[PDB]
Structures are given as structure tokens and as C-alpha cells.
Amino acid sequence: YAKSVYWENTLHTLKQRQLTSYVGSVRPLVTELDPDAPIRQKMPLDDLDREDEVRLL
Amino acid sequence: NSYKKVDAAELLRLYLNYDLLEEAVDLVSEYVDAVLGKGHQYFGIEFPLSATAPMVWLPYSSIDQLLQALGENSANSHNIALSQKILDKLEDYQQKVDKATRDLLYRRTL
Amino acid sequence: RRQLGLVPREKSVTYGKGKLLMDMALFMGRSFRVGWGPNWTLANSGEQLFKVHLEKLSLRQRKPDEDMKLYQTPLELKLKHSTVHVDELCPLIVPNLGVAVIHDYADWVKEASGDLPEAQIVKHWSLTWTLCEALWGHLKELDSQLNEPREYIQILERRRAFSRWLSCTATPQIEEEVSLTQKNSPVEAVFSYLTGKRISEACSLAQQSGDHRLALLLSQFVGSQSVRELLTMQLVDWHQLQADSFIQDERLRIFALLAGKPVWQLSEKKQINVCSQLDWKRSLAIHLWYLLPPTASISRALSMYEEAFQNTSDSDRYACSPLPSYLEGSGCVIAEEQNSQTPLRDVCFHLLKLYSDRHYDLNQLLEPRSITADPLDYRLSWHLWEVLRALNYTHLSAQCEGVLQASYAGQLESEGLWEWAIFVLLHIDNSGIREKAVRELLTRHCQLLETPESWAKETFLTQKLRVPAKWIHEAKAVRAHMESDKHLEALCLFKAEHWNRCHKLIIRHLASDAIINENYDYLKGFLEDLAPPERSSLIQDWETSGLVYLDYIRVIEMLRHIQQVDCSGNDLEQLHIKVTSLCSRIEQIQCYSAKDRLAQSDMAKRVANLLRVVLSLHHPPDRTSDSTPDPQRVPLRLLAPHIGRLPMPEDYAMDELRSLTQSYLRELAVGSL
Amino acid sequence: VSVINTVDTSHEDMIHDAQMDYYGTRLATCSSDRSVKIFDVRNGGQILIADLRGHEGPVWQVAWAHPMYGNILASCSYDRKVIIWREENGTWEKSHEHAGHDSSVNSVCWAPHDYGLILACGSSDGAISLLTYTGEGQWEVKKINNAHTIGCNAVSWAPAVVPGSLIDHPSGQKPNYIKRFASGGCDNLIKLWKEEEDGQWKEEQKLEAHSDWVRDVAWAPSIGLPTSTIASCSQDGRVFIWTCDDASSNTWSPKLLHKFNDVVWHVSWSITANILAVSGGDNKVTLWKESVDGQWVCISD
């Protein structure tokens, strides 16, 4: 699903949550984008990146 | 007037357990008036009966038993008047539980 | 006061007010919920079938020495006539394709038909299995034949046997009907004998009443079609001539029966229905004896009887439905129930249908209402289906098989035959439902007390039904956690899907108290059978926990042995290596409480003293003084590097340092001579 | 029927629920007297184990956990609370307290043990909560806001083996446990709910046939039966059975079982799924059975 960045959908979701127009539901996600953030924060990715990481591994 | 801010129903159970029927009639008279905004806060109640608040409650099990405990002495006109003093007051209450239910349903269907 | 009752609902101030949502004491202040339990138990908070009742759905009023034999005998017959397959994780039980089961059941009910108080139900089951004997079972008239018996000779003797069954199922009502009618009307009494084929008694009563020409007519009727056709003319004559209306309607009913006419139309426009007021069996027996030739099949007698009760476009109904044997005699004219589009009949009729019509409905056949006055008694329903499944009938629905198997397994749970509820659930073809249903039921019924009754059921399930014993002890572990016995939880987790659960329980609940009591040999009993490489390679955290406790015990045992026998330096090298391997591993135990800190610290203190005794046996004296080996001669140089890793309390470490300074002062004082 | 016991449950006020453990050895009972009372009932005895006061309102349901997790009980109240209680060393204390609801919490139900230790709770604000035990004392909490309009009244889980849902699986893999539950409310709806591949919870299907507020709803235990079945009841006095005859169709049929003279309060499935119990507004229970002809017959009247 990702085709221009690593964890593209979670990166897009964070770049969207920074906008003061975010009238979305706040799904718990990582707030950092190093590859240890899911295990340091004990928080998930969004499931497109979470499929690609499981496919890739 | 400390226990009213904790449980007026456990007090009403005690008053029925001890035959204090006139104190039970005026405790019920104060409790119904507490839910109706004549000092809700003295009965621990956060909010009086309103289509803008949590839903309210009353110990009807104890009130049915109080109306029986009065009516078991039906030869006395005072027991009849004390029973009417509950019943007539429970309709100035329940007509407003009906209206507050209609006012709330018209705020969960818009 | 005394407390009063809950005020009855039609005197409640809450009455009718359940919609007043803003007051929860009106919206729910008179609601209640009820909870089921195993064995068909219910916790009732209302009125019976503050307080709560515990109530049980149970069939009849308990004679366990009698009631249980009507379950257990059919079940120990069916368990001879299925195969057990073991090629899946949960075994499957499948019928033996054949006929034998019909005799196992028919002769069992012949023995059971005596003094037993269920005698009405047991006698209806006797009619059902002797009907299966007469349709699909076997013989006393073809076993005499020393050659393979022709299809028609079989069909003839099946009809001769059923031509007894339809008299035997009719006599007690005929014998009461005659006892009442004989003295008021001998014509009705003679007709009642004829509807049971008692033609000798009918002729006898006709000679006794003064009706000797009725006796002559009836004696000549046991074969001849000429008398049937001469009466067929004589009835046509009496009708056309309008002379019928000077003969008794009850006598015209006999003449119509003999003439092979099910209904006769009189010149009055009266009709005489020959099957009127009768039961279902004598109605079918009239079709088998008077409306058909001696050579016809059972299947034609039944189809002509169905042609007598169905709504055609061209003929009225004249035969009757008349029901299972618990609704007979009742006077119940069923006024066509305005929901129930299938009118109830006997299981014996539904089996005769299935013999005559291979695609007839199995649902009306297997429903308990066709068998008994109880919608909960599936005893015969399941044992009929697990004969029809063996007779290669396969057009039941999987919901209807599921409802039959689950209802009969629940009937076996409710009266405590839970091992036979497993036998029923092991006939579930669907493996994923079969394993679940057996693991769930085991998890309810397995006891921590291994009673003679639990042991008999567990040995029955494992040695007959091949149930994987791992689930009996999984169930005992799930029970042991609820009853808090961590020894029986460890020991039942050990017999089951196991490895890790038992180990991580032992290290939190058993290891430290066993060390504190010096009960090493008990803790060993769990740990040496956890230790095998086929098991320990599947245990989390083993080498820093269970292996440390176990190597400590085996180090104590190998010194317990060297303190009793002339053992070799090779074994003392091994002991020193095993002790050195243990110091920097007591270092690594997970401890949760001061019990675990006590176990770890006295293990460490014991190891510091074991190391001294092992090293003084590596440093024995010269052969000039016959003294015992001194643990205070050990070189400091071999003690301190290993004691400087032992987790030991400040008072244990202080007195270890006093022992180490004592041996250091000897390494000095023997260095100055 | 036949009586085993007639427990004198020491409640001074109306009892709203009465539930036994998985083995029928204990009894828990809740009431308007701000208490849950636990008993031993073995062999027809009665012994009080605990008077669990510490809800502050009337308590509307109790639920025992599966014994695989040990001696755990949940209960819900008018005060917005759901309290979890546990017996350890033989003493009872509180093991969780959730107050995250905006009105009275009217029902609670545990998951099948195969899903993990998960509780569901339904509230008079209109929401549902799910509470998952994460380990050694901790809990996750999910809140499905607005799950029913007007209010939520009852919750009941789907059993961990859905019929047919195993045929495609080659021997040696695990079952993929498709977690589901049903819920009823004052919108006249029964709704079916599922967990998705994101761990969020979703309205899967609706069941619309009552003309008045749904009081209660219960899923049938999948034992022997190849179908997926639900019961539900209403303020108009109906009871409906609901079948799902193909788990891949996800399609349901409404079958009317009865319509009583007043409200029906609760629906309760037998531990062998073959029988339904029904609480009537006239203080009664009635008992109901599916025939081999698939018709629903009474066994109490």
C-alpha cells in the first residue's frame, strides 16, 4: 500500500492531526516515527502500514 | 440531615423496620420534593428532574410498603390522610416524569 | 415492624408506568433476571414453577434404581452397534450399517415390559420395536427354511406378523367395548370383535345372542370373494329397492365391512362409515383385512388408509388420525388447531409411512409428542434416528439432528449421565463442534476428588469412547484454579495441554515453601518429569528457574550419596562442576515475596557450605593421621570467587566472611613452618 | 418443575438479577439495597460468602467469569459504575471499578474465554463499553458511543465457534476467532457488533421487528446446533427468536415465539442451548422448547 514513504499512512495521519481542521476520531497511534516508537510507546500503526510491515517481514 | 446526603432509601427501610410511619410520610414528602428542585442537594442528588441530566430514582418498594403499612390500620382517618398526602404528591411528581420523558425523547429523536 | 412482602403488581404505585424513562424506579424498578446452571438448573427471582429459588427441570419423581435402567440399557446396546474412529483430534462414533439393533431393542423391551412403573411408555416402545421387527427385523417363520427365502415369502410373513400386531394393539379396547355393549347391543359387540379379527368370538357371540345367520355369514367369510360380491349385490338391491331403511344401521355397518365397503350411502341419504368412532390401528386393520386381498402388501393397506383421511377434491374423510397411546380414549375431537398445520399421529404410523413411502417426513417421526406425553423425553427419538441412520435414511435436516443430539445430551446431563451425554455428542459428524461440545462438558463435570464414580466415568470415556485424557485433566486444572488447590492444579496441568502453565505456577506457588520445609524430594517429583528435552525445550524461563531449583536438589542428592559410599574423584569433579554451575544461577532466580527471598538465600547458604565439603574431599590429608577431612582446611583461593556471587542476607554474609577469615589465617599459619 | 432450594438472600429490597457460577455451586444476587450478595448453594445448603456493598445505586445485573481466570464477578449500577470483584485466598475485594458512563449501566456480559478475559457493558446514555484484561492487574477500555439511540438496555456475546466458519482451514492452523456480540435498546433495534482488523468495533447488522423498546437480548450457545440463533424481548410484550441459517450470508430471519399480556423483562438460554427461559411482567418465568418440526412450544403453562 505504501509507495513513496516508509509508514506512509501513519505519517499522513500525523501530518493530518497537526492540522487544526482535524474533526476526526483520535485512534491511539504512535506519535514518533522511528521504527522503535510502536514498542517504546506500546502504541499501534494504522492498518495499511501494519499490513505492509507484516507482508514485508 | 447528614444521612439524607448518603441514603434516604436506607433511612426509609429503617423507618419501616421501626414503625416510624409519620416520619416515613414526611421523609417521602421531602424526597419527592428534593427530586423536584426543592433542595435536591440535601438528598445528595446532583441534578433535579430535567431533560438535560442523568435519570432519577425513588424507593417505590418502600413506598408501596408504606402505603400498605398505613392502610393496615384503615379504621384511622389519619392513616388515610397520610396515604393521600403521598398519593396526590406522587402525581405532581409523575406528570412531570412523563413530561420530562417526552422532553427527553424529543432530544434523542432530533 | 415485621418487613412486609413485595406489594403485588396491581397494587404497586409503579403499575403500568414502565415507559416513564426519566425515573429508573418506574423504567426498571419492577424488572428481574434469571440464571441457568448445569444439569438443567435455574435460579428464579420471581414466582415458582427477598428470596431466590433454585429449580430443576426433571422428567419424573425419582426411582434411580429403576429410571436409570431405561437410559443405560439402550446405551450399552447402542455402544455395541457403532464404531469409534480416532483419526481426528476428537474421536467420532458412527452406526454399524445393518439390522441387528432392532433385536437388541425388541427383546430388551420384551424383558422390560413387566413390573416397571413407566409401563405405559415401555409398552408403547414395545409396540414401536415389535413394529420395527415386523417391518425391518427378523423371523420365526423363515429361519425354518434351509434355503435363501424368496422376497414374496418374506413380504407374506411380514404381513402375517403385522396381521398379529394389529390384533394385539386392539384387544384390550375390544374386550372393554364388548363388556359394555354385550348386554345392551350384541351387534356392536360382534362388530368390535370383527375390527380386531376375532371372527371365532364374533360367530360365538352371534350363536349366543340368537343371530345364527350372522354366525353362518361370518364363518364363510374367512377367504371367499363370492360372499363379498353376493353381499355387494344384496346391498345395491336393498338401496335401489328402498328396503335398507328397514334394517339396523349397526347391522348394515357389519354387512358393509364384509362387502369390503368403507362407507355405504343409504336411500335416506344417511351414510354408514365403517371406520367411525374407531382408533387409528383398527382403522388401518380394516384396510389390511376387509378392504384388500390376502396377497397385497402392507404399503397398499397404509396408502388406502391415507387415501381415507386426506382432503381430496372428490371424496370426504372417513378414516381418522387417533393418535399416540396417551391421547387414545380421551374423547378429544381435535377441532383443527388454527396454527398447527400438521395434525399429530403415532410414531408407529410415521414408521409405517417411512416403510411405505421412503421419502416421508422424519421430523414428525422423531418428535417426542408422537411417542410420549412429554416434550423432554428424547430416549426413543435418538435411538430411532440412530437406527434409521443405520438403515440408510439420510433426509433429516442438520438443525433437526443438532436439536435431537443436543436435547438428548441435555436430558443425559440433567439426570447426571454426563458420560453418556458425551457418547451422544460424539455422534456429531462436525469435528469443530464435536471437540468443543466434549471439552466444554468435561470442563463442567470433572471433579478434583477422584471418586469411584469419577474414576468409573473417566475409565469409561478413555477405554470405551477413546476421549483424549488430556481434556479430563485440563478440566481438573480449570476446577483446581476455582477451588484454589495449587498442588492439584500443578498435577492436573501436568497431565494436560501443560508444559508452561504448571512450571510458572510452581515457581510462584510451590517452589519456595517446599525449599523452606526442606521438602526437596516433593519439589523434585514435579521438576525431574518437567526436565526431559522433549518438554523442557518447550518451557519459558526454565534454565534460570526450574533447572536451578532442580540442580540444587540433585547436588544435595549426589552429596547424600557420597556421604554413604566409596565414590570416585570423577564423581567429586562432577560435584564441584555442578556446584560451580549453580552459584551464578541462584544469582538469577525470580523472587516475588520474602518466602522466595528465604528459599533463594538458604539455597545460597546451603551451596556455600556444600562447596566447602566438596573441596575438603578434593583436599584430603597426608597418610600420617587417621582423622576425618576438615572443611576448615579448604583454600580461600577456591571459595571466595564463587561465594562472591551468592545472594545472601547481611547476617549470612557476615558469618561466611568469619569462615573465610578462619581459612585465610590457616593459609598464613601453615605458610610459616 | 421441581425445587432444590429457596435461598433467603438477606436482601431488604427488590432483586434485579440471580446468577450461578459455571458449575452451579455458588449464587450471586443484586438489588436496590446497594449490594451484591454471594452464597454457597452446594447440595441444597445456603451459606453467605459476602455482602458486596460498594456500588452506590441499585445494581441491575451480575456476571461470573469463566473459571479459567479464577473466581471473578462483575456487576453494573444506576450510579454509572461497573465493578469487578475477585476472591483470592478466600477473601473478596474489588479488582476493577469503571465509572466511564454518562448514565445508568443496565447490563453486563463476559466474553467466551477463547476471546480472552473481556467484559461488555450497556448504558442509558446510549453507549456500550468493552473492558479487556491486559495482564497482571491492568485493563484496556473501549467505548462505543451512541451504539443505541434513546438508550442501551442489554448485551450478549456470540460463542467462539460460529457454525460453518472452520471448513476452509487446513489442519495445523489456529481458528481465527471472529469476536461478535448482540445488543438491544430504546431505539427498538437489536444490533450485531464485530471487531475489525484495526481492533475497532463496528455495527455489522440490524434486527428490526419489535414495535416498542427492546428490553433484553441473548445469543444461543453453539453446542451441537449448526445454526446461529438469538432471542430478544420488548416493552410491547413480544419475544422473537432470530435464526442465521448460513454464516457466510450473514442474513437473519425473525420468528415470533409469543406475545405476552404485559412487558417481558429478560431472556435466558439453557447451558445446552435447547431451552429458553422468559421473565414476564406478571412476576412469572415461562419455559420454551424447539420441536423437531422447528416450532416453539411452552413447557410451563
Side-chain angles (χ1 to χ4, degrees):
Chain A
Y1 303 123
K3 295 190 181 187
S4 80
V5 203
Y6 178 55
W7 295 349
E8 204 165 345
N9 304 271
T10 299
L11 172 63
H12 187 287
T13 297
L14 288 171
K15 283 174 170 174
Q16 199 189 98
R17 284 169 183 201
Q18 287 172 337
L19 295 168
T20 51
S21 303
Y22 190 90
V23 195
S25 189
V26 188
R27 170 190 177 137
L29 289 180
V30 294
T31 66
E32 297 165 301
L33 289 176
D34 62 282
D36 250 343
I39 302 180
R40 187 175 60 258
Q41 304 192 1
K42 305 194 179 198
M43 291 291 177
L45 305 175
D46 219 294
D47 320 284
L48 299 178
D49 318 308
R50 205 169 62 81
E51 258 214 272
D52 292 338
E53 195 65 56
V54 170
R55 292 162 183 182
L56 179 55
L57 278 170
Chain B
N1 307 296
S2 168
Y3 196 27
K4 284 175 177 174
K5 286 198 177 190
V6 180
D7 199 9
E10 207 162 27
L11 183 55
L12 183 62
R13 293 170 201 123
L14 284 161
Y15 284 183
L16 290 166
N17 290 335
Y18 286 101
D19 299 290
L20 298 183
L21 303 187
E22 303 204 47
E23 257 293 289
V25 169
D26 287 78
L27 177 63
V28 169
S29 297
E30 269 196 67
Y31 199 166
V32 175
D33 266 351
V35 184
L36 293 176
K38 308 183 201 155
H40 63 100
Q41 299 144 23
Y42 313 122
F43 277 65
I45 304 161
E46 306 144 289
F47 307 107
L49 176 65
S50 188
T52 67
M55 297 129 74
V56 297
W57 182 97
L58 287 178
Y60 289 109
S61 42
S62 304
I63 295 165
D64 306 326
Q65 285 197 10
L66 179 56
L67 291 166
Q68 181 175 323
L70 291 166
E72 281 170 351
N73 299 268
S74 54
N76 187 9
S77 50
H78 195 52
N79 288 64
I80 297 170
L82 290 170
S83 183
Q84 290 171 311
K85 177 181 175 183
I86 292 171
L87 292 169
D88 310 353
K89 194 172 193 173
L90 287 173
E91 223 194 273
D92 184 49
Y93 178 65
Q94 288 178 354
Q95 289 183 18
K96 302 184 202 112
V97 185
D98 183 12
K99 194 186 176 280
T101 298
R102 297 176 198 214
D103 299 337
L104 175 63
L105 290 168
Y106 197 73
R107 295 169 191 197
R108 293 190 172 177
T109 54
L110 292 181
Chain C
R1 212 171 195 97
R2 293 181 179 181
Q3 288 185 346
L4 300 177
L6 181 66
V7 175
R9 196 191 132 154
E10 36 66 277
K11 298 171 197 85
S12 181
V13 187
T14 77
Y15 184 76
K17 295 164 193 175
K19 294 195 176 199
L20 299 193
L21 182 65
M22 279 301 307
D23 183 343
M24 280 305 228
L26 300 181
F27 178 82
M28 278 168 66
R30 291 297 199 117
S31 65
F32 64 98
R33 301 176 181 282
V34 296
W36 287 93
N39 320 282
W40 297 351
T41 316
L42 183 70
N44 185 8
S45 51
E47 291 181 37
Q48 199 214 283
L49 302 177
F50 282 73
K51 280 184 164 287
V52 168
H53 314 295
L54 302 182
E55 287 181 59
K56 189 199 169 191
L57 192 69
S58 48
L59 272 161
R60 280 95 221 276
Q61 296 185 353
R62 287 177 161 173
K63 286 163 141 261
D65 316 72
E66 289 163 65
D67 310 341
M68 295 297 101
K69 293 166 178 162
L70 297 178
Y71 294 95
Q72 291 174 349
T73 321
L75 288 168
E76 282 284 72
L77 292 174
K78 184 57 184 177
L79 184 52
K80 300 166 180 129
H81 296 286
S82 290
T83 36
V84 189
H85 307 267
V86 205
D87 315 71
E88 293 203 81
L89 287 170
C90 189
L92 176 64
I93 305 181
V94 182
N96 296 353
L97 300 176
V99 169
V101 190
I102 297 175
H103 292 284
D104 294 72
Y105 296 163
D107 291 5
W108 161 60
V109 187
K110 290 163 210 167
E111 290 199 310
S113 68
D115 315 71
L116 201 72
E118 294 235 281
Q120 291 178 269
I121 293 172
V122 180
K123 286 167 187 173
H124 209 63
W125 297 1
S126 200
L127 298 186
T128 310
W129 292 119
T130 58
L131 182 61
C132 290
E133 185 184 333
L135 296 178
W136 302 290
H138 223 52
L139 275 51
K140 287 195 176 177
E141 310 90 338
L142 303 127
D143 44 306
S144 59
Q145 309 183 25
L146 298 174
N147 292 270
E148 191 169 80
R150 307 180 195 142
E151 297 168 278
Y152 180 72
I153 309 172
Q154 300 185 44
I155 291 163
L156 177 58
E157 295 308 331
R158 299 306 165 169
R159 184 170 177 199
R160 285 167 168 184
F162 188 56
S163 193
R164 305 166 198 143
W165 190 102
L166 284 173
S167 191
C168 300
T169 54
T171 95
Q173 181 171 343
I174 292 167
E175 289 168 297
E176 184 159 67
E177 279 174 11
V178 170
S179 84
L180 298 171
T181 52
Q182 173 190 82
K183 301 153 198 151
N184 300 291
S185 180
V187 186
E188 287 142 62
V190 165
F191 183 81
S192 187
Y193 282 139
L194 294 172
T195 61
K197 207 194 182 186
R198 287 181 162 208
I199 299 172
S200 45
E201 294 158 74
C203 290
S204 299
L205 184 58
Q207 287 208 98
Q208 290 163 25
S209 66
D211 202 345
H212 296 74
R213 292 196 202 197
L214 184 59
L216 271 161
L217 183 64
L218 290 175
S219 63
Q220 291 193 240
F221 241 101
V222 193
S224 187
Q225 182 65 8
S226 72
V227 198
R228 183 161 287 147
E229 289 178 14
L230 290 166
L231 283 188
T232 296
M233 207 71 68
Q234 196 77 98
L235 288 167
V236 165
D237 309 326
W238 289 328
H239 179 35
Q240 287 180 113
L241 298 170
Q242 307 196 267
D244 55 349
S245 36
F246 315 123
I247 308 176
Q248 303 177 256
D249 303 87
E250 313 75 48
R251 186 178 293 277
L252 289 165
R253 189 182 177 156
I254 300 166
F255 297 157
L257 177 69
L258 295 177
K261 312 301 178 249
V263 184
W264 189 261
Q265 178 66 86
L266 297 171
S267 77
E268 289 182 67
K269 308 184 180 182
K270 287 174 174 168
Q271 289 184 2
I272 295 172
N273 172 4
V274 177
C275 301
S276 59
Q277 314 149 276
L278 303 182
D279 55 283
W280 89 258
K281 299 143 291 173
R282 290 191 294 173
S283 294
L284 177 58
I286 289 163
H287 294 79
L288 193 67
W289 300 328
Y290 299 96
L291 310 181
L292 276 172
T295 51
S297 68
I298 300 175
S299 326
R300 192 67 203 128
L302 197 82
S303 42
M304 289 180 62
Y305 161 64
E306 180 148 58
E307 289 156 33
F309 67 61
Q310 291 197 12
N311 295 59
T312 76
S313 37
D314 309 76
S315 294
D316 315 80
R317 302 186 188 154
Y318 75 85
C320 66
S321 52
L323 300 160
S325 58
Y326 73 89
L327 298 178
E328 296 193 83
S330 67
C332 191
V333 181
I334 301 177
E336 302 198 309
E337 294 173 23
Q338 302 180 10
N339 303 292
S340 320
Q341 301 188 13
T342 38
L344 186 62
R345 301 181 184 113
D346 187 346
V347 64
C348 289
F349 170 76
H350 294 302
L351 288 163
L352 277 159
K353 268 293 302 181
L354 190 66
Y355 177 91
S356 308
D357 176 1
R358 271 293 208 148
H359 294 108
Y360 182 71
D361 179 38
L362 300 180
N363 303 288
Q364 286 163 93
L365 192 158
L366 299 169
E367 175 65 358
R369 287 178 283 148
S370 70
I371 312 173
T372 70
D374 203 309
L376 303 172
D377 189 16
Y378 289 89
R379 282 177 296 179
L380 191 72
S381 299
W382 188 81
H383 284 305
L384 280 169
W385 176 237
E386 268 294 338
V387 166
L388 295 182
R389 199 149 88 141
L391 294 179
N392 301 233
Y393 299 96
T394 54
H395 63 279
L396 188 64
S397 104
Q399 174 66 9
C400 303
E401 170 136 46
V403 168
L404 283 171
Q405 293 196 18
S407 301
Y408 187 48
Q411 188 185 355
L412 291 169
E413 189 185 85
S414 72
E415 305 305 339
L417 301 180
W418 65 257
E419 79 282 36
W420 292 104
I422 293 167
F423 176 70
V424 174
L425 295 167
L426 287 172
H427 294 74
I428 298 169
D429 310 69
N430 189 296
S431 191
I433 299 174
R434 188 174 65 255
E435 182 168 317
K436 183 190 173 202
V438 176
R439 287 178 83 158
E440 163 57 15
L441 191 160
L442 285 170
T443 305
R444 304 167 193 181
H445 290 280
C446 290
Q447 301 178 6
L448 254 63
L449 301 179
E450 304 195 322
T451 58
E453 293 159 85
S454 195
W455 191 94
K457 292 186 184 220
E458 290 175 65
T459 53
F460 166 89
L461 291 174
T462 53
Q463 306 183 34
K464 298 191 188 167
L465 310 195
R466 312 305 174 180
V467 178
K470 56 166 189 151
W471 299 324
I472 298 175
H473 301 294
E474 179 173 52
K476 289 174 174 178
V478 174
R479 187 71 192 190
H481 188 26
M482 197 211 63
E483 299 191 286
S484 292
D485 183 346
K486 306 301 155 190
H487 170 61
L488 291 184
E489 199 184 329
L491 182 60
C492 290
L493 287 172
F494 182 93
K495 301 161 189 169
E497 310 201 335
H498 198 194
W499 308 120
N500 293 271
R501 287 187 176 162
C502 178
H503 157 259
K504 293 195 166 184
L505 179 155
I506 287 159
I507 301 299
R508 284 187 177 184
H509 291 266
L510 295 174
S512 44
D513 266 345
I515 293 291
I516 290 164
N517 287 264
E518 300 208 83
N519 196 12
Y520 304 117
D521 310 67
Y522 164 89
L523 181 59
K524 183 173 176 161
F526 284 104
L527 293 176
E528 294 269 69
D529 219 6
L530 285 167
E534 303 175 305
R535 308 177 182 182
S536 54
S537 67
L538 306 175
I539 297 173
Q540 290 180 345
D541 324 331
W542 174 252
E543 291 230 352
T544 50
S545 64
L547 190 62
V548 189
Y549 284 108
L550 181 59
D551 294 341
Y552 170 83
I553 298 161
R554 286 197 264 78
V555 160
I556 289 171
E557 289 176 286
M558 210 171 87
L559 190 65
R560 287 177 182 173
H561 179 240
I562 290 172
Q563 289 176 333
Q564 295 177 15
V565 182
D566 322 67
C567 291
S568 82
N570 312 4
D571 316 302
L572 200 77
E573 282 186 292
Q574 276 185 77
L575 188 50
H576 184 45
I577 293 165
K578 290 163 195 178
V579 173
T580 304
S581 177
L582 181 63
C583 299
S584 61
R585 273 196 294 147
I586 298 170
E587 183 193 81
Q588 301 167 14
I589 299 175
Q590 292 179 353
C591 290
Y592 287 95
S593 69
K595 288 186 170 198
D596 320 313
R597 294 174 251 143
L598 177 56
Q600 185 180 31
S601 54
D602 246 279
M603 283 168 68
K605 174 178 143 211
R606 186 75 77 205
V607 164
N609 285 265
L610 288 164
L611 182 62
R612 288 173 172 80
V613 178
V614 174
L615 288 171
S616 63
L617 293 171
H618 279 288
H619 294 123
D622 309 81
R623 299 179 184 172
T624 48
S625 59
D626 308 340
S627 57
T628 40
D630 182 8
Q632 305 168 358
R633 275 184 179 214
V634 177
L636 185 80
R637 317 183 200 190
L638 301 178
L639 285 169
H642 304 315
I643 295 160
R645 300 191 182 199
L646 289 178
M648 290 180 62
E650 293 140 46
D651 65 299
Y652 292 6
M654 179 60 66
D655 303 334
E656 274 292 321
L657 286 166
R658 290 162 181 170
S659 173
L660 289 167
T661 44
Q662 195 193 49
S663 67
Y664 180 54
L665 288 168
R666 294 177 181 196
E667 281 201 48
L668 293 176
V670 184
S672 63
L673 294 173
Chain D
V1 176
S2 64
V3 181
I4 302 179
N5 201 346
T6 302
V7 188
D8 242 325
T9 62
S10 72
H11 281 290
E12 289 194 83
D13 208 335
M14 185 65 190
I15 295 175
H16 301 299
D17 194 11
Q19 301 296 325
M20 297 197 300
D21 62 303
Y22 183 81
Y23 310 95
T25 60
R26 302 176 183 239
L27 176 68
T29 61
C30 75
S31 174
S32 292
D33 61 22
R34 309 180 182 220
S35 78
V36 181
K37 298 178 193 300
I38 303 181
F39 301 84
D40 185 354
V41 297
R42 287 177 287 189
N43 305 348
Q46 57 168 13
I47 309 177
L48 181 74
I49 302 179
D51 187 15
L52 304 181
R53 295 171 178 248
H55 282 291
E56 287 167 76
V59 186
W60 303 120
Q61 197 174 356
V62 287
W64 295 94
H66 190 281
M68 175 172 153
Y69 301 99
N71 298 354
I72 300 166
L73 186 74
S75 59
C76 60
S77 176
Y78 171 65
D79 53 34
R80 313 128 213 179
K81 301 181 173 192
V82 183
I83 303 173
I84 312 181
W85 316 76
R86 197 169 193 225
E87 190 183 79
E88 301 198 82
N89 306 313
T91 46
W92 285 79
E93 291 199 60
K94 292 185 178 185
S95 57
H96 196 10
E97 181 161 313
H98 165 81
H101 285 299
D102 340 284
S103 192
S104 171
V105 186
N106 307 323
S107 175
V108 283
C109 192
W110 293 102
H113 53 280
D114 334 77
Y115 297 168
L117 182 66
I118 310 176
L119 186 68
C121 331
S123 186
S124 305
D125 42 51
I128 294 173
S129 59
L130 304 173
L131 296 79
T132 307
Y133 185 72
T134 49
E136 307 254 76
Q138 295 187 7
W139 297 85
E140 174 218 63
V141 187
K142 312 184 186 189
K143 191 177 177 177
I144 310 172
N145 300 299
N146 306 80
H148 284 266
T149 58
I150 302 166
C152 191
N153 300 335
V155 291
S156 183
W157 290 88
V161 178
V162 182
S165 192
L166 285 171
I167 293 167
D168 313 16
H169 291 259
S171 39
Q173 300 200 64
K174 282 188 174 185
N176 293 332
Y177 293 146
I178 309 177
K179 303 187 196 155
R180 305 189 197 193
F181 68 82
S183 64
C186 292
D187 48 9
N188 304 359
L189 308 181
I190 299 92
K191 292 181 173 196
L192 309 187
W193 298 84
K194 190 211 166 197
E195 201 160 61
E196 292 282 67
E197 299 177 278
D198 62 0
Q200 298 191 98
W201 277 77
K202 178 177 173 177
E203 189 170 332
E204 182 186 41
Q205 174 62 298
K206 296 193 183 180
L207 297 180
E208 307 193 353
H210 297 282
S211 49
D212 209 351
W213 298 336
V214 178
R215 289 298 186 163
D216 198 72
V217 58
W219 215 304
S222 56
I223 297 171
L225 302 180
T227 58
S228 169
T229 299
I230 291 171
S232 69
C233 72
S234 175
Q235 173 60 75
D236 56 22
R238 293 178 211 217
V239 182
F240 276 107
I241 300 300
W242 307 75
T243 69
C244 172
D245 318 350
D246 169 7
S248 78
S249 81
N250 235 13
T251 295
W252 293 74
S253 94
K255 194 174 192 173
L256 187 73
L257 174 150
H258 201 269
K259 191 271 157 200
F260 292 84
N261 295 297
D262 199 91
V263 180
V264 179
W265 288 129
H266 183 235
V267 286
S268 204
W269 286 111
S270 77
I271 292 190
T272 51
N274 70 314
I275 297 157
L276 186 72
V278 180
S279 298
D282 52 346
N283 320 324
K284 291 190 172 195
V285 181
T286 57
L287 299 182
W288 298 81
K289 179 59 169 74
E290 191 158 85
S291 61
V292 192
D293 42 289
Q295 300 186 101
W296 281 78
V297 189
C298 203
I299 67 178
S300 52
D301 308 77

